[PDB]
């Protein structure tokens, strides 16, 4: 499967994943809103944002 893996609002980049869902994860630290993108569908802490999707390049 093919997922975005670029951080926050850096330039779009993608990656091949042996998983079937992609993820977009977002939280607040002293920098502001931070976004992580990758392969899979991880558990996150309460309050943290997580979008897992079944398509390709869905985690924009």
């Amino acid at each position, epitope marked *: 499967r093919i997922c975005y893996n670029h951080q926050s609002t850096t330039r779009a980049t993608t990656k091949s994943c042996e998983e079937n869902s992609c993820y977009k994860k977002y*939280w*607040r*630290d*002293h*920098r*502001g809103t*931070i976004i992580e993108r990758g392969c899979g569908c991880p558990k996150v*802490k*309460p*309050g*943290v944002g997580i979008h897992c999707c079944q398509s390709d390049k869905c985690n924009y």
Partner: antibody, heavy 117, light 108 residues
Framework: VQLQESGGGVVRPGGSLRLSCAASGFTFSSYAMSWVRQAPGKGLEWVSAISGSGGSTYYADSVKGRFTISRDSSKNTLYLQINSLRAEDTALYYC???????????WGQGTLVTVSS | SVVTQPPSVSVAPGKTARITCGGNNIGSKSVHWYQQKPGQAPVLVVF???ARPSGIPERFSGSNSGNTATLTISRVEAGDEADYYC???????????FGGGTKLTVLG
């Protein structure tokens, strides 16, 4: 990647000091930066942090309204302005580069502030 | 949130050291661990509960659930003697909370 603090020394209670931290080997403005202090023989105490742009600042309750954090991207330098100094501000002052979840992945060697009349 | 570390832990070389960081619902927060040797700056050894920065030995492992986060140092060595600090991140507040530190003695 390096951080180097300066500006510490002996200062009177009710006095003022400006601490500086010179950063190198990374894109300075992409990272939040923190000041953390440590009294001799005591634990780490977070003092203040600042977003990449300087648009957000954050302070410990103990220092609200006496300390000001600022940065200058052109000089790759972080500052801490410490006013109305108290005995309890005596500490080694570290600057740190933050990462994910305010983890502090790079530290300087610290600058010593001694508050005495 | 007050976070509680034991002031000291002693372990024989080769044994496993466990340093705890206690706080109500710390399991819902993210915990980092620092190593500080005397006259040195802190070094990040675990971040986000269980991740290891590159160059940190595999003997250093973290966990976090419920009211307890733990730094576990397996096969402890004389060179691991240090003060250890936990740091708690919470998505819903700004303040940086550190535990009071734990002195790890490696018993020689």
């Amino acid at each position: 990647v390096q951080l180097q603090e300066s500006g510490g020394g002996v200062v009177r209670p009710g006095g003022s000091l400006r601490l500086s931290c010179a950063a190198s080997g990374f894109t300075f403005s992409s990272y939040a930066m923190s000041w953390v202090r440590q009294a001799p023989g005591k634990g780490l105490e977070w003092v203040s942090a600042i977003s990449g742009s300087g648009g957000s600042t954050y302070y410990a309750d103990s220092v609200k309204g006496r300390f000001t954090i600022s940065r200058d991207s052109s000089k790759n330098t972080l500052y801490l302005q410490i006013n109305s100094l108290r005995a309890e501000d005596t500490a080694l002052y570290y600057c740190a580069r933050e990462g994910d979840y305010d983890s502090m992945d790079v530290w300087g060697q610290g600058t010593l502030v001694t508050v005495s009349s | 949130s007050v976070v509680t570390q034991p002031p000291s832990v002693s372990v024989a070389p080769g044994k496993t050291a466990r340093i705890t960081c206690g706080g109500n619902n710390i399991g819902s927060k993210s915990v980092h661990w620092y190593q500080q040797k005397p006259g040195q700056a802190p070094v990040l050894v675990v971040f986000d509960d269980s991740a290891r920065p590159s160059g940190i030995p595999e003997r250093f492992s973290g966990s976090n659930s419920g009211n307890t986060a733990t730094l576990t140092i397996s096969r402890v060595e004389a060179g691991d003697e240090a003060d250890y600090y936990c740091q708690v991140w919470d998505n819903n507040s700004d303040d940086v909370v550190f535990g009071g530190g734990t002195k790890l003695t490696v018993l020689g």
